[PDB]
Amino acid sequence: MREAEHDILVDAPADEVYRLVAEVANWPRIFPPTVFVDHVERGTERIRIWATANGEPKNWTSRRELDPAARRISFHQEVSTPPVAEMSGTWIVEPVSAATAKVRLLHAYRAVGDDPGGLAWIDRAVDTNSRSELAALKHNVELVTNPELTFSFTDTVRIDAPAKDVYDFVDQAALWAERLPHVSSVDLREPSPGLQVLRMDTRAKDGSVHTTESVRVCFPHHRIVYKQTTLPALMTLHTGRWDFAEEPGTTASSEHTVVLNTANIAKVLGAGAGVAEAREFVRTALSTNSRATLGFAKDHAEARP
Predict the structure, then answer these.
(1) Which residues, at least 6 apart from 225, have a Cβ–Cβ distance to it below 8 Å?
(2) From CA 125, how far away is CA 120, in angstroms rounded?
(3) Strand partners, 101
(4) Exposure string (b/e) for 130-150, b if CB count within 10 Å is 16 or more?
């Protein structure tokens, strides 16, 4: 049973870093591979994680024990793939000043049959993954705690039809080239039920054209959660959520969370443009396309010829 430990310094207070790892609704913002997390068992807890996994999205479950006083989180991967016999870890967040924290990431693992070759392979994997994870954690935590760079907004429409018909319109994205005017072509991959890799060709208002990938997690007939995996120069993160709530009609909403990439604001929008201008440019483009999609979803679900 081998042990490893990696650490990094992060410029946010210990309590906030702890909170971002403890509260899994935050994972997509701080772990770039993570698309969504939800609970299997609440209490100790068990969670189900959907992630991009280097081009082959997948889900798995993890059991965690949370200790907020000690700012520690123990986790244990529930199904391991050979040659991993078991994989567990611990987050430990330590205050080193009032605005700055040391994040320690520990792992404990062993190989099936303590096979020395497999165990070396695991060791390198854990090292590679832990370093990249901690580096991304630092980069993203320092951005998502900055409210000028990170913003979220929602557009809502009321649709007088069952949630299922509205959901189906947004779920069945293979049909969007025939149903949405801004979509010229779609390449929808659905390797396993409810996990989608959506690649689509669009034309924007300014006459530019795009080919964009997102990974979506679909929950019939109430929610579709997604993350954009091919990002434009102005965004470091873009996640979203469709919700279809049945009223005692349906209220359909499209939420977006964005983190801006300040390094490219000038190169893209030209000198003199700032964060405020980037927030609105991005917000209008996304909100326009979303309200458009909701409108066509309404028209489709309410048609009863």
Answers:
(1) 35, 36, 50, 216, 217, 219, 239, 240, 241, 242
(2) 9
(3) 10, 95
(4) beebbeebbebbebbbeeebb
Rounded Cα–Cα distance for residues 131 and 156 (Å) = 40
The closest of 35, 26, 32 to 219, measured between CA atoms, is: 35
- How far, rounded to the nearest angstrom, does the alpha carbon of residue 294 sit from its chain's CA centroid? 22
216 touches 196 (CB < 8 A): yes
Q: Is there a contact between 43 and 131 (Cβ–Cβ < 8 Å)?
A: no
Smallest CA-to-CA distance from 127 within 89, 78, 169 is with 89
Alpha-carbon gap, residue 108 to 86, rounded angstroms: 8
**CB-based contacts of 209, cutoff 8 Å, min separation 6:** 184, 201, 202, 203
Residue 168 backbone phi and psi in degrees, to 5:
-55, -40
Q: Which fold has domain 147-305?
A: Alpha-D-Glucose-1,6-Bisphosphate; Chain A, domain 4 (3.30.530)
Experimental method: X-ray
Contacts of 128 (CB under 8 A, 6+ apart): none
What resolution in angstroms, rounded to 1 decimal?
1.8
Tell me the fold of 1-146.
Alpha-D-Glucose-1,6-Bisphosphate; Chain A, domain 4 (3.30.530)
**The dihedral formed by the CA atoms of 293, 295, 299 and 302, expressed in degrees to the nearest 10:** 110
Cα–Cα distance list, 237 to 111, 221, 232, 266 (Å): 35, 26, 9, 18
Q: Mapping DSSP to helix (H, G, I), strand (E, B) and coil, where does residue 71 land?
A: coil
- If DSSP codes are grouped into helix, strand and coil, which group holds residue 220? coil
